Amino acid sequence: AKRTKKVGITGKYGVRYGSSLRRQVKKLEIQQHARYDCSFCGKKTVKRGAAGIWTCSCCKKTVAGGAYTVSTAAAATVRSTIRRLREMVEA
Amino acid sequence: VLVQDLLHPTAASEARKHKLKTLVQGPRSYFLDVKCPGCLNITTVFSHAQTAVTCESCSTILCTPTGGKAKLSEGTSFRRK
Amino acid sequence: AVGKNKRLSKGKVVDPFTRKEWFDIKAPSTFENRNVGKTLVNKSTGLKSASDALKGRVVEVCLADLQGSEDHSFRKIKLRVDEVQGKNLLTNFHGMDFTTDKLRSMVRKWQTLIEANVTVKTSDDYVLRIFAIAFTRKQANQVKRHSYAQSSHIRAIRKVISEILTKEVQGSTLAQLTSKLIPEVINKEIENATKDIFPLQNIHVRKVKLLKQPKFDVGALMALHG
Amino acid sequence: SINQKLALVIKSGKYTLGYKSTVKSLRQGKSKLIIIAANTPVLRKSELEYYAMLSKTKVYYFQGGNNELGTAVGKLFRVGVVSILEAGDSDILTTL
Amino acid sequence: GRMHSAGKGISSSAIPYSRNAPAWFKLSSESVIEQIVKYARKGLTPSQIGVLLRDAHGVTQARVITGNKIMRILKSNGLAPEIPEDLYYLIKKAVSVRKHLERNRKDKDAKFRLILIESRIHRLARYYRTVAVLPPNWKYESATASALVN
Amino acid sequence: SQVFGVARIYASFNDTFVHVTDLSGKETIARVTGGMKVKADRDESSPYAAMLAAQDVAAKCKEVGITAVHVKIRATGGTRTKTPGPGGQAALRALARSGLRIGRIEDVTPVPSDSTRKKGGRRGRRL
Amino acid sequence: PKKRASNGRNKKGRGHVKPVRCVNCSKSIPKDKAIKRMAIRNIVEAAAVRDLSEASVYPEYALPKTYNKLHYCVSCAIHARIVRVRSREDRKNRAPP
Amino acid sequence: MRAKWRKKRTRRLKRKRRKVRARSK
RNA sequence: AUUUAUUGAAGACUAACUACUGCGAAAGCAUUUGCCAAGGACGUUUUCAUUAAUCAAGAACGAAAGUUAGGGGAUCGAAGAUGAUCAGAUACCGUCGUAGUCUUAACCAUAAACUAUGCCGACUAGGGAUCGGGUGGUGUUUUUUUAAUGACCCACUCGGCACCUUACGAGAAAUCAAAGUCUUUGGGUUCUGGGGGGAGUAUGGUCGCAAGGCUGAAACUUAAAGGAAUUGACGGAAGGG
Secondary structure (H helix, E strand, C coil): CCCCCCCHHHHCCCCCCCHHHHHHHHHHHHHHHCCECCCCCCCCCEEEEECCEEEECCCCEEEECCCCCCCCHHHHHHHHHHHHHHHHHHC | CCCCCCCCCCHHHHHHCCCCCCCCCCCCCCEEEEECCCCCCCEEEECCCCCCECCCCCCCCCEEECCCCEEECCCCEEECC | CCCCCCCCCCCCCCCCCCCEEEEEEECCCCCCCCEEEEEEEECCCCCCCHHHHHHCCEEEEEHHHHHCCCCHHHEEEEEEEEECCCCCCEEEEEEEEECHHHHHHHCCCCCCEEEEEEEEECCCCCEEEEEEEEECCCCCCCCCCCCCCCCHHHHHHHHHHHHHHHHHHCCCCHHHHHHHHCCCHHHHHHHHHHCCCCCCCCCCEEEEEECCCCCCCHHHHHHHCC | CHHHHHHHHHHCCEEEECHHHHHHHHHHCCCCEEEECCCCCHHHHHHHHHHHHHHCCEEEECCCCHHHHHHHHCCCCCCCEEEEEECCCCCCCCCC | CCCCCCCCCCCCCCCCCCCCCCCCCCCCHHHHHHHHHHHHHCCCCHHHHHHHHHHHCCCCCHHHHCCCCHHHHHHHCCCCCCCCHHHHHHHHHHHHHHHHHHHCCCCHHHHHHHHHHHHHHHHHHHHHHHHCCCCCCCCCCHHHHHHHCC | CCCEEECCEEEECCEEEEEEEECCCCCEEEEEEHHHHCCCCCHHHCHHHHHHHHHHHHHHHHHHCCCEEEEEEECCCCCCCCCCCCHHHHHHHHHHHHCCEEEEEEECCCCCCCCCCCCCCCCCCCC | CCCCCCCCCCCCCCCCCCEEECCCCCCEEECCCCCCEEEEEECCCCCCHHHHHHCECCCCCCCCEEEEEECCCHHHHHHCCCCCCCCCCCCCCCCCC | CCHHHHHHHHHHHHHHHHHHHHHCC
């Protein structure tokens, strides 16, 4: 059914380590165990192997990315600004 | 005004009003016979059209559309109906 | 305040005018009044080289001074110190700018202001940011009080202005640009471009700023002072 | 727009999805048009370009992925490629 | 009065008194019918079909030219769509706003607007499920709708 | 013909500065202020003290050899009051009546587009 | 009671207006509510005009002016006599003399 | 007194009641 | 130092134009350009056909302040420090200045959140101005004098933000085109109030990280509080003598 109200994956941590620290880890633990979308095949077979190794089982590829999510917002801004300056220089 | 013949008004007042306010609503649009040069292919066209209509020949476009009526191209023989 | 100071020297005269020499600055070939003023600098010891210590300068002077007229009064030219040749030193363009009172005069309400900007390169390796000011206007035979535009008119006016600016300066070199801003052909180009949008009075040009120059090119500068 | 023209062919015409059936049709000459997703192996993409070069068929690249192209045709899976064998009703082959 | 806003606009049509039209067009019911099926056969909607017929042929409105209306005609000649036209457009606009949201998570105006669109969806779906053009157990759900637009 | 300086007056409330310089500006001549003339912290902005400072810098610049000046009037601007103090008109009239020649009066007060923040609270200065 | 009909401001169909700061007190007051005036004043203030004209290198000189808008709060306006209090019948003269 | 400060006096008072009652439990 | 001249960096902000002007469900929204979807009004001889109005429960958004973690961090500035003025002044005024002010992710769910005026529909006095769409006039002006288009003028219309005058009508009055069509009482629906205080307090649930929010009494006390106007008196309020 629905077992727990609000601890989620941090109910394995029990009554320890403080609610706030259990809350913060919760956000990132969800993020790191989830399946994501491979840009190469579109399928939901991307998972973390290790910190910043995100590999897709179906299409057998691996992409470098954030330790806990596969695209970090810092790197997103960098992609966009690289694209701007790259188009400009050949132009 | 105290009294007026609302059952028999003047043509000018019912032409002045909105078309949904007359004693029996009816449209203020119309239809039109139009013919591009060359082939006759005498075609009917609506006033407030929303389309860019032509003749069966080719792109011989007659009425470009606008938010109210449709603006007809320059070389077009057109006529009320 | 003459006797208020609590300390003049926490650390524990000769007249600089006799220590300073005068210099006389000239315009380029693009302005009829060549001689425009003078300036001062310390005597060129071997320690300092007053020539370069003076090279680091710029001067604002009015275009009425530079053209003998009174219609050009409301525009001022900043000319940069780029060459010194034996006490008749020379300048070159740095930037046009209006006088704040003229600008504050044409702006008034119950009209609509429009402004455009371009960041465009010229033919001769400079890169300039030009601006353009336009106002709307009550027609003659009009009776309403304000004459406000409709903002789609404004994007269209902006676009046609900006493309005229880019079109002109891309092909006009710096000296050519200077030579074409004194008559203000740009304004008549705009008004003939825009009379199918809005009547649009007060179409003057506005300031223009070297954002990064090329190499000096002393030959071209001396070519200007032929 | 483009998705409506593709939908008309799905309703009226006929088609085949996927790499294997497409290249089978392309060998036979039976196809008219191919659409290829953009998330796609560039090798497979280029291979289809070669096959369509031989067959003289036309090619179009879809601003989307296999998932997006699949939703367009009205199916509920990933479609990296689709082969139009005949349309009958649409102006798809004529336009674009 | 125009439920999802505060406007009281009345920009409508005014279909005339002449229920037998139009005194100059003397072509046949069968001709306008074959034209209707031709437009519906290239896959047009009844609204656009009547628009086209009106502003290109002499067609005041199909209900007086023929004996009946265009949706009835299409149901009778076998081009009866799976669901109603207006419901189809609401679902299209819904998925559009939904994908806009999923790429731009802070357009709260668009979240609100999506809520109103889906409310309208639900209301017209309830009307259809009560009057049997749709069956009960039908329901807007998101991914199935994204598929159903074709 | 005429040698030119520039007049640069700054007529802030609480002080009216005058100093004269070359057409370029870096060559400075004879900075004097109202507070240099008088004692009391209130008459720093006094137009009398302003004309005093104006006449001395006119004398100094005449004995250095200037003939005319192009005038630039200024006030605080930026965030603050944006309008001059009385020492402006006073100093400009004084140097004008001193006999130095006059050209190109212009206002160059900082008139900022969209400033940062004007001080003294939301409710204001509760004087 | 409601002393006015526009509540001392001009807001209809808005609900909000960005503020402006005054110039004597610098109180954050809205824009529609303020006591905006306009100063268009000759720089010479009409007294030194003769002196500047004679000391000009060039005659027929335009002699420009200071242009500036003046945002006032209600308090500083009333105190400096810009506006003043009006009878219960002459509050409604929405135009000036 | 002013109504706003009446709210502030009660709120500060109220949070003091909360804390002391927390002490017993 | 203050000042003036040539640059540079950082962050915030969007003057003047800016208004009895626009858009938005409300809070709110002002440099340009590009993309993303949305929306109102108008025009319609298109289509469906009563699908609709208002709503306990329930959900979405919700100024500022405030909270959590990153960035950022210039002005301004709760706290705090010093100058004073004062009988006192940790208040006004001055000079510093941390939190904050900006942004990303997540919370908070209030405001004089006001037009103190629920939402939907109808009918009823005039007049002019204005915003958006539409219609008509060999109208004026505009390019190549003159075609279009555009921008103006005139007339009409629908929908808006409001206004000016009356007062038939209403109200306790101020006032109001609704706050009218209510003792000649009934178009449809929702929420709230029953003298002042105690008290939006206590307790109990419930939501929130907290601050706090939603629901929310009683005892006891009192004959008044309160609204709008009239005349006087007063004012470190103005105008005149």
